[PDB]
Amino acid sequence: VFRIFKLSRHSKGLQILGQTLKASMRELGLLIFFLFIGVILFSSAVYFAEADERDSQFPSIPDAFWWAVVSMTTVGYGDMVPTTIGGKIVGSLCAIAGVLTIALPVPVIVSNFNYFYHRET
Amino acid sequence: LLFEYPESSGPARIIAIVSVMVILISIVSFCLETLPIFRDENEDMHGGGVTFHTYSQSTIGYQQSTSFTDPFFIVETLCIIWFSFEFLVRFFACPSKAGFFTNIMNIIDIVAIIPYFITLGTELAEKPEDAQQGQQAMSLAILRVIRLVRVFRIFKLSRHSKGLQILGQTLKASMRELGLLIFFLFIGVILFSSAVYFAEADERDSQFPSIPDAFWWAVVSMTTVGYGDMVPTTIGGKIVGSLCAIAGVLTIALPVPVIVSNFNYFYHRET
Ligand SMILES: [K+]
Numbered sequence: 571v572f573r574i575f576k577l578s579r580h581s582k583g584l585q586i587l588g589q590t591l592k593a594s595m596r597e598l599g600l601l602i603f604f605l606f607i608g609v610i611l612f613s614s615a616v617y618f619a620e621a622d623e624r625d626s627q628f629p630s631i632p633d634a635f636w637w638a639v640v641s642m643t644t645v646g647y648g649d650m651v652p653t654t655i656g657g658k659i660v661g662s663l664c665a666i667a668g669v670l671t672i673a674l675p676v677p678v679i680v681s682n683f684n685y686f687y688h689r690e691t
Numbered sequence: 692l693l694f695e696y697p698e699s700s701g702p703a704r705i706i707a708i709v710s711v712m713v714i715l716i717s718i719v720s721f722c723l724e725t726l727p728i729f730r731d732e733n734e735d736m737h738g739g740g741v742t743f744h745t746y747s748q749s750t751i752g753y754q755q756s757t758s759f760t761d762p763f764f765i766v767e768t769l770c771i772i773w774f775s776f777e778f779l780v781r782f783f784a785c786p787s788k789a790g791f792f793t794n795i796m797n798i799i800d801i802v803a804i805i806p807y808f809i810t811l812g813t814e815l816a817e818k819p820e821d822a823q824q825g826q827q828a829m830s831l832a833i834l835r836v837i838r839l840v841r842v843f844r845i846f847k848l849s850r851h852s853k854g855l856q857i858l859g860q861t862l863k864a865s866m867r868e869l870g871l872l873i874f875f876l877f878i879g880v881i882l883f884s885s886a887v888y889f890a891e892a893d894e895r896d897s898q899f900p901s902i903p904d905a906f907w908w909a910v911v912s913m914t915t916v917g918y919g920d921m922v923p924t925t926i927g928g929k930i931v932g933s934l935c936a937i938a939g940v941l942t943i944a945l946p947v948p949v950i951v952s953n954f955n956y957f958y959h960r961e962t
Contacts (some may be wrong), residue, residue, distance in 0.1 A: 600854045600958075607855070610718065611844050617725070618838030629727035641916055650918035658907055665914035666873070673947050674954055 582690055590682040601675040609638040612664040619656030626652045630664055642668025692783055699780060711851045713770055718845065720766045731756055747790025771804040795859075799846050800871040806840035839956045853961055861953040872946040879942055882934040890927030 578584030591598065613634040621629045626648045627637055627642050637650035727733075762915045778800055786947045787793060793898040809815075816832030820908045831959060849855030862869065892900045899909055908921035912935050 574814040592921075603852070606724055607848070609843055611842060614838065619843070631722040632726070644915050646911075646916040648916050648917075651918045651920040653882065654919075658903075661916070662876075662910045662914075665910070667877050669914065669943060670947070670950060671751070673951055675831065677951060688838065 583687070586683060586690065587599075588686045589686050590679060594679050594682045595676045597675045601672070604671045604674070605639070605642070608642065608667055609635055612660060612667070613638045616652070616657045616660050619660070620652055620654050623654055626654050629655075638664065640644075641665055642672065644668060695780065695783075697778070707851060710773075711848070712897065713773070714844075714848060716760065717766050717770055720763055721841065724763045730758065767807055771807060774800060774804050796847075796850055799843070799849075803840060806836050810837055825878045854958070857958045857961065861950060865950050865953045867947045868946045872943070875881050875942045875945070876910070876913070879913065879938055880906055880936075883912075883931060883938070884909045886959060887923070887928045887931050890925055890931070891925050894925055897925050897930075909935065912936055913943065917938060 575584075578588065579659055586592070616637070617629050617631065620626045626668065627634065633649075640647055640650070644648055644665065698704070722831065737750050738746075739749065740957070747811055778797070808834060813828065814832070817826070818832065824831065846855075849859065884902055885896070885907070888900050888902065891897045898905065905921075911918055911921070912932065915936065
């Protein structure tokens, strides 16, 4: 899987992508950290709010965690979906929270990348 | 006490890494325990079936498998107590009564324990006449609080989590911007649901009309989640899909730059 990477000596963009990430870690570390908190929270409510009526998105937390991550990144594979009413708000508040939190660490990483790409060029 | 606060809030030492670890290990624990309420029970099975002499004594099993939560109750019992010991020490600080300035960290702290502690008394939530009249089968108080409360536990992290302090300050001081987003989204959602309603149900079986169901679709389609649970086989919603999805991204993108900016000044700051 790792083989691809080597390319970066004949790939300037990768040198640029690297320098950003290696020097942009705290910003990236926050994103995933925030996402973690979000994911956990938004999973535990749907749990408390769905399983009463039968067959909906399998409760057990590490399965509702799949849904939460997905719904936010706004991927929504549709593998997890609730026929119920309680998760209706969650869908709303979660999806909203995703875009908010996801958009947060973007401008910084992007900015770093802009100075770095503009540079070796 | 000027030497216990060294052990308490302020300095960076062993006790801070342990508390965050209790939180994390604790969260992981409750998580896994809540999954299979019944341990190692789904597999080879049987029941009350008349086929032959077999259904008679049905193999319910008389010594099957141990059922236990003591050690995890230990996770909860021991955490709440350190919470209270410390929080109780945190009183050897400075006190008052309010609901605004004081300390949201202390409110959040108390909010995780007081529920589990409370839940242990069989009941004491005599709430409403019509409800209490017959608490009958109702674990309603337990239904409401027990899960909201434990959901809340994660938050505490924010004293050892700067990003959360930053996320907070933004939101608390960025409310009007956030309030507009949801308000705009509301207007959008409602509107975009009522047209599809007028435009879909003529031919049969499409996305269940009734407005609070088309509202699910509208919110989803915009946030651009599109679970595919609601989709129309029809032609009228075709434009709506277009105009709605377009409107979503437009409206959603609007309150982003402000909240982000606030966050940038706040994150850049404590740093
Ligand atoms: K986007």
